[PDB]
Amino acid sequence: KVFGRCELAAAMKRHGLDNYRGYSLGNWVCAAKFESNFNTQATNRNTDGSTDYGILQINSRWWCNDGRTPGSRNLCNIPCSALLSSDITASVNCAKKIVSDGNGMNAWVAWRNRCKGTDVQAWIRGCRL
Ligand code: NA
C-alpha cells in the first residue's frame, strides 16, 4: 500500500503514535516519507546484510526476524514480513519499542538527517485529524 500523507497521519494517530515519547505526528510522517515514500512494501538491504522493512524501514539486525541476518535479534517478536502489511499496526507497535530504546527518533538516520529540527508540522498541514 502507498499511503497518502494525511491518510498515514490518520493511521499513525489512531494507533497512538502522535506525541509518542514526545514526538509530534509530523516527525513520524516525515520519517515515513524519507524511509519508505509512504510505501508499506518498501525493503532495502543494508551493507551489513540486514534488511530494513516497511513504512518505517525497521531493521532485521535488532527488531524483526527475516531468517537471513546472522547474529541478529528479534526484539519486536515478529517476522519482518509482518512489517510490509497494508495495516501499519505491527510497524507502529515495533516503532514504539525502537523510539523507547534510548536515542529517541535518532534510531532513524533519515529522521536525523532530513527531519530533525525542520518544520515537521508541514507534514500534517491541511490534514483533518
Ligand atoms: Na533479526
Q: Is 66 labelled a binding residue?
A: no
Q: How far is the CA of 105 from the centre of ligand 1 (A)?
A: 20
> Domain tally for the chain?
1
Q: Which of 110, 109, 96 is nearest to 23 (CA)?
A: 96
Q: How far is the CA of 50 from the centre of ligand 1 (A)?
A: 8
For the record, the C-alpha cell of 101 comes out as 530504546
Kindly state whether residue 97 falls inside one of the protein's structural domains: yes
CATH number, domain with residue 49:
1.10.530.10
Q: How far is the CA of 29 from the centre of ligand 1 (A)?
A: 25
Experimental structure resolution, Å: 1.6
Catalytic positions: 35, 52
Kindly state whether residue 129 falls inside one of the protein's structural domains: no
Task: Give the domain range for residue 85.
Answer: 5-124
Are 114 and 31 in contact, with CB atoms under 8 Å apart?
A: no
Dist CA 27 CA 23 (whole Å):
6
Dist CA 97 CA 76 (whole Å):
7
